[PDB]
Short mmCIF file of N, CA and C in Angstrom, two decimals:
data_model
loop_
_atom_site.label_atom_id
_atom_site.label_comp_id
_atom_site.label_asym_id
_atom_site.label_seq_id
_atom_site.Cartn_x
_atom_site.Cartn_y
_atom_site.Cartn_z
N UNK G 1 -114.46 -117.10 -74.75
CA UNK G 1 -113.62 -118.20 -74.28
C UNK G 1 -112.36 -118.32 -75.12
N UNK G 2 -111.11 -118.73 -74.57
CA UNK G 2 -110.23 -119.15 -74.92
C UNK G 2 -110.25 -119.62 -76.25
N UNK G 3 -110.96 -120.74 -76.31
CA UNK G 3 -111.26 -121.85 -77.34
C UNK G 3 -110.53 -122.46 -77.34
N UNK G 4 -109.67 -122.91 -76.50
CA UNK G 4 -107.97 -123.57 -76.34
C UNK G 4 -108.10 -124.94 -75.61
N UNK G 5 -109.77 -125.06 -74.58
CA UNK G 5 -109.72 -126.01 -73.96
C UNK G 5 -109.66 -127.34 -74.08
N UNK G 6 -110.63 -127.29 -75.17
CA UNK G 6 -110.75 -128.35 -76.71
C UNK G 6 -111.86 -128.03 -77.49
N UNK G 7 -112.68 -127.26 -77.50
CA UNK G 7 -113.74 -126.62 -78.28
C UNK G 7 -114.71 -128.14 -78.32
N UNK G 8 -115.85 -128.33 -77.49
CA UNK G 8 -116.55 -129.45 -77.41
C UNK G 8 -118.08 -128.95 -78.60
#
């Protein structure tokens, strides 16, 4: 993943 989405 990205990790950009907001990292939950």
């Amino acid at each position: 993943i990205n990790m950009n989405y907001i990292g939950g």
